[PDB]
């Protein structure tokens, strides 16, 4: 079950730790992805600000809407919402 902002499934781990990432890829964590800070840091250099961000979102960083998507991802990363309950197409794999 991941958050999908289009035809690509994007997880909330790398995005949540996107603002503060300092370690190799981290699989599932016993902690809940709800401690993420507040969205509001639109950053997208040539590819992506975080040299190890949700690479699966590479396309998002190469798209002009990344500025609006990045923030959104950060919010959902700090809160499941309907995605976790498949209440909408926000989460795929349900």
From Swiss-Prot:
Whole-protein coverage range: 22 to 115 of 115
Gene Ontology CC annotations of this record: extracellular region
Keywords assigned by UniProt, alphabetized: Disulfide bond, Secreted, Signal
Taxonomic lineage: Eukaryota, Metazoa, Chordata, Craniata, Vertebrata
Principal cellular location given in the protein's record: secreted
Subcellular location: Secreted
Described purpose of this protein according to its UniProt entry: Endogenous activator of intestinal guanylate cyclase. It stimulates this enzyme through the same receptor binding region as the heat-stable enterotoxins.
Gene name as annotated: GUCA2A
One GO MF term attached to the UniProt entry: hormone activity
Domain of life: Eukaryota
Disulfide bonds: 48-61, 83-91, 86-94
Family named by the database record: Belongs to the guanylin family.
Identification of the protein by name: Guanylin
Expression across tissues: Highly expressed in ileum and colon. Found in plasma.
């Amino acid at each position: 079950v991941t958050v999908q902002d289009g035809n690509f499934s994007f997880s909330l781990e790398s995005v949540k730790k996107l603002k503060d990432l300092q370690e190799p890829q981290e699989p599932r964590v016993g902690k809940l992805r709800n401690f993420a800070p507040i969205p509001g840091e639109p950053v997208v250099p040539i590819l992506c600000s975080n040299p190890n961000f949700p690479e699966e979102l590479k396309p998002l960083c190469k798209e002009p809407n990344a500025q609006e998507i990045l923030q959104r991802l950060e919010e959902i990363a700090e809160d499941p919402g309907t995605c976790e309950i498949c209440a909408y197409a926000a989460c795929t794999g349900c």
